[PDB]
């Protein structure tokens, strides 16, 4: 009935069929926000999954709407193996328990696994 509206802060190219493409400045209305870090959004003549990372809102552009860290950590387990790609990312194996310390909206959460701390995809994690 009254959809939130956001503004693309960079160009995005579709990698998959479900995705939508962006060009900087595009103004989208947001249909669904997934903790995955992918948001379903509509334009004129276009609708698809968009990385939330690539959006400012049209409200208070520089203020974050991310949660804030919980350095006590919260219990999660990996549902699917992921290999680190960047240096700040954490490789896990399916089934490993971790502690989530920051549920960033972008889909790349901060986690602690014993003596390694870093970024990991929220889509590949689950609660316990």
């Amino acid at each position: 009935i009254i959809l939130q509206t956001y503004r693309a802060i960079a160009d995005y190219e579709k990698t998959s069929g479900s995705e939508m493409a962006l060009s900087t400045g595009d103004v989208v209305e947001v249909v669904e926000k997934s903790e995955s870090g992918w948001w379903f959004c509509q334009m004129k003549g276009k609708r698809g999954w968009i990385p939330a990372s690539f959006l400012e809102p049209l409200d208070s552009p520089d203020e974050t709407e991310d949660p804030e860290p919980n350095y006590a950590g919260e219990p999660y387990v990996a549902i699917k193996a992921y290999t680190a790609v960047e240096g700040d990312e954490v490789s896990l194996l399916e089934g490993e328990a971790v502690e989530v310390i920051h549920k960033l909206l972008d889909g790349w959460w901060v986690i602690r696994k014993d003596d390694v701390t870093g970024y990991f995809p929220s889509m590949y994690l689950q609660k316990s």
Binding site: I9, A10, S16, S53, E86, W108, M123
Partner: peptide, 11 residues
């Protein structure tokens, strides 16, 4: 949604 995670943030 897509089965791969999205990309890391840019800019």
């Amino acid at each position: 949604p897509p089965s791969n995670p999205p990309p890391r943030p840019p800019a």
